[PDB]
């Protein structure tokens, strides 16, 4: 189990270095340009809400680990509204045809973004609570890397425009920083092998999402955020 927690740090240290994040943290580039990837998260954020509401959560469970997951899911299932809040603030909540919105979400350029929650649902669907906690810890660690990064230009725009950002914001990183129990557990021989595969898959799928964000920024480099004071 210490190995599993050490692999998660190893992957986070790799994950933290991706070009996307070097770009996002680059105070030499305007924060509006660094948040060009923002509308991309539309293919993920509400899927993530549903992963928490409908896939992770088991309300009827007595399992020690499942009751902790249930509390966690109740928090994480709230963040999609924060995504919609900042979409409007950043000027990305634009008038379009319904079909344009569907074609955007279901773009082949947002495949890995769109299917990250799907892959996690398939991975998790027959795991015991303890093994679900490994899935959630890895996923939560990747999320904290991304939002730590995105809160840099997010908080720069929030200060310059005198508006309260909720998603690409320190307040979002604060709740997810919380997201002392894995430490307090030891895995079967089989469980350790499954755990390593889980951590490897979640970071591989998260890196695939970040790869699409990077390509979108390049392909749509002019489509900067348009916040108003």
Ligand X SMILES: N[C@@H](Cc1c[nH]c2ccccc12)C(=O)O
Query: What sign results for the dihedral spanned by CA atoms 214, 215, 218, 224?
Result: negative
Nearer to ligand X, 102 or 160 (CB): 102
| Tokens describing residue 99 | 């079909």
Rule CB under 8 A: say whether 101 interacts with its own copies: yes
Question: Binding-site residue total for its own copies (CB under 8 A)?
Answer: 31
* Long-range contacts (CB closer than 8 Å, 24 or more residues apart) made by 71-75: 72/136, 72/179, 75/175, 75/179
The interface with Fe ion within residues 30-89 (CB under 5 A) comprises: 79
Cα 34 from Cα 217, distance rounded (Å): 8
Rule CB under 6 A: say whether 79 interacts with ligand X: yes
Residue nearest to ligand X (CB): 143
Rule CB under 6 A: say whether 182 interacts with ligand X: no
Query: What sign results for the dihedral spanned by CA atoms 34, 9, 115, 73?
Result: negative
79 makes contact, choosing from Ni ion, its own copies, Fe ion, none, with CB < 5 to 8 Å by partner type, with: Fe ion
C-beta of 189: minimal distance to its own copies in Å?
A: 22
Q: Give the residue ranges of the annotated binding site for Fe(2+).
A: 76, 79, 140, 172, 176, 179
* List 16, 33, 50, 155, residue binding its own copies (CB under 8 A): 50
Maximum separation of any 2 CA atoms in the chain, in Å: 57
Rule CB under 6 A: say whether 147 interacts with ligand X: yes
Asked whether the beta carbons of 187 and 195 are under 8 A apart, the reply is yes
Site string for Ni ion, 112-131 (x = CB under 5 A): --------------x-----
Residue with tokens 């990305």: 92
């Amino acid at each position: 189990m210490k190995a599993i927690l050490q692999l998660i740090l190893e992957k986070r240290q790799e994950f933290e270095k991706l070009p996307c994040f070097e770009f996002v943290r680059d105070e030499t580039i305007s924060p509006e340009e660094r948040l060009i990837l923002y509308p991309c998260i539309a293919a993920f954020a509400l899927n993530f809400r549903d992963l928490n509401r409908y896939d992770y959560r088991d309300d009827n469970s007595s399992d020690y680990y499942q009751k902790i997951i249930n509390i966690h899911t109740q928090e994480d299932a709230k963040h999609w509204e924060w995504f919609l809040n900042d979409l409007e603030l950043l000027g990305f909540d634009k008038t379009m045809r319904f079909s344009e919105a569907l074609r955007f979400v279901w773009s082949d350029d947002l495949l890995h973004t769109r299917r990250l929650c799907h892959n996690i649902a398939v991975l998790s669907h027959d795991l015991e609570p303890v093994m679900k906690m490994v899935v959630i810890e890895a996923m939560e660690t990747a999320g904290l890397v991304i939002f730590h990064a995105l809160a840099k230009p997010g908080e720069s725009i929030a200060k310059a425009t005198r508006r309260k950002y909720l998603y690409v914001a320190d307040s979002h990183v604060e709740v997810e920083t919380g997201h002392t129990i894995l430490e307090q557990t030891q895995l079967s021989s089989e469980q350790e092998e499954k755990a390593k595969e889980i951590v490897n898959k979640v970071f591989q799928w998260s890196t695939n999402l970040i790869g699409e964000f990077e390509r979108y920024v390049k392909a749509h480099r002019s489509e900067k955020a348009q916040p108003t004071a």
